[PDB]
A paper describes a structure:
The key enzyme in the salvage pathway is hypoxanthine–guanine–(xanthine) phosphoribosyltransferase (HG(X)PRT)4. Five compounds synthesized here that contain a purine base covalently linked by a prolinol group to one or two phosphonate groups have Ki values ranging from 3 nM to >10 μM, depending on the structure of the inhibitor and the biological origin of the enzyme.
The TBrHGPRT1·4 complex refines as a dimer, while the TBrHGPRT1·5 complex refines as two dimers. Ki value of 3 nM with 70 nM). As found for 5, the carbonyl oxygen of 4 does not make any interactions in the active site. The difference in their binding, therefore, lies in the positioning of the phosphonate group attached to the nitrogen atom in the prolinol ring.
Numbering used by the authors:
A (entry chain A): 3 to 79, 102 to 195
B (entry chain B): 5 to 81, 101 to 203
Write the structure that this text describes.
């Protein structure tokens, strides 16, 4: 047993560890955008949330950004010309999605574009791509939780965990 | 009040979560004979309205603590739900025009059962009769932001549900006019 979850071989990042890492990222974002005079209504940071599972990351991250004085408005994948855009994704793997999203948003002429991902899987790149902000790295191993799914289940798990091979083989 | 844009805090984050844990226990009890399990038979969460991502993110994790596994779908600005149990989530229920349509549409697919859970219910806003099975907070006719709820797309990130200062929206409203 040892692992808290009967469906996981091991826990990689707890909810608390993820929030701690996300607070470190939020401090950097607060400093990086301090010369942008972000304000609710007049000038929020535009959060563009990409991929269905990212709703969890996105919910926690905007709240933490608020704790740090970075006000936001959210879009899920418009009116962004001259606004700062921060694309959120719960997992960066091949980078094919984020490359397409970033390139498409540039056509709307935002004042700036950066990306922030909860889980970077550098081993999966099919094109070169570096996110400006990375909460945590994961090696080659199939993880679920914190919004990340296996066949639509286990997104609600509060930690990022390694899915036990027996689960997806059988399924 | 620590928010300069708010008249006062109405529901703290902790109060919302406490109330959501009470609701979660009822849901775990209500569905306990449905044999919910991941993959095989999760509860299907249908999340409606853009601001509902915050409520939905917290609620599925809390339902997980209570042994209710889920999968999620979004309807903002459907799938294999026939024979499945469906719980529709919405951060605010007001006129009920949206939820009435979503539920009736979903019923055309003949789920095993369908219920609604809402974070904020404003009973005084109804334009048609509607009662959610599960209600985190019943709110009177005051204008609130936070916990997913916006004013012109801002303030969703506020961790509490707070009463917006009238000056904020009459000043912003006026400004939005100088632009049109
Ligand atoms: N759950 C999980 N998926 C993994 C893992 N390693 C790779 N994948 C792939 C599966 C596929 C679909 O994933 C949507 C998950 P959601 O965002 O809805 O939570 N991915 C992308 O599409 C990334 C966007 P990319 O950079 O590749 O374009 C990631 C892992 O360990 N765990
Ligand atoms: N922010 C805020 N909105 C309030 C309040 N009282 C009423 N409303 C309305 C405004 C309008 C659009 O709000 C989407 C917010 P989001 O879901 O994206 O978070 N509503 C609906 O459309 C409900 C769906 P209905 O039941 O009417 O069909 C709720 C309040 O106090 N505060
Ligand atoms: Mg997905
Ligand atoms: Mg909305």
């Amino acid at each position: 047993p040892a692992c808290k979850y009967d469906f996981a071989t091991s826990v990689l990042f707890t909810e608390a560890e993820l929030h701690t890492r996300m607070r470190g990222v939020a401090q950097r974002i607060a400093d990086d955008y301090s010369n942008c005079n972000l304000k609710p209504l007049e000038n929020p940071l535009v959060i563009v949330s990409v991929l269905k599972g990212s709703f969890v990351f996105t919910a926690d991250m905007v709240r933490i950004l608020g704790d740090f004085g970075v006000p936001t408005r959210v879009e899920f994948l418009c009116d962004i010309r001259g606004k700062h855009v921060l694309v959120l994704e719960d997992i960066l793997d091949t980078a094919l999605t984020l490359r397409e999203v970033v390139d498409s948003l540039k056509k709307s002429e935002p004042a700036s574009i950066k990306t922030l991902v909860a889980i970077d899987k550098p081993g999966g790149r099919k094109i070169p791509f570096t996110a400006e902000y990375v909460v945590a790295d994961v090696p080659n191993v199939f993880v679920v939780g914190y919004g990340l799914d296996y066949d639509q289940s286990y997104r609600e798990v509060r930690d990022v965990v390694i899915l036990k091979p027996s689960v997806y083989e059988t399924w």
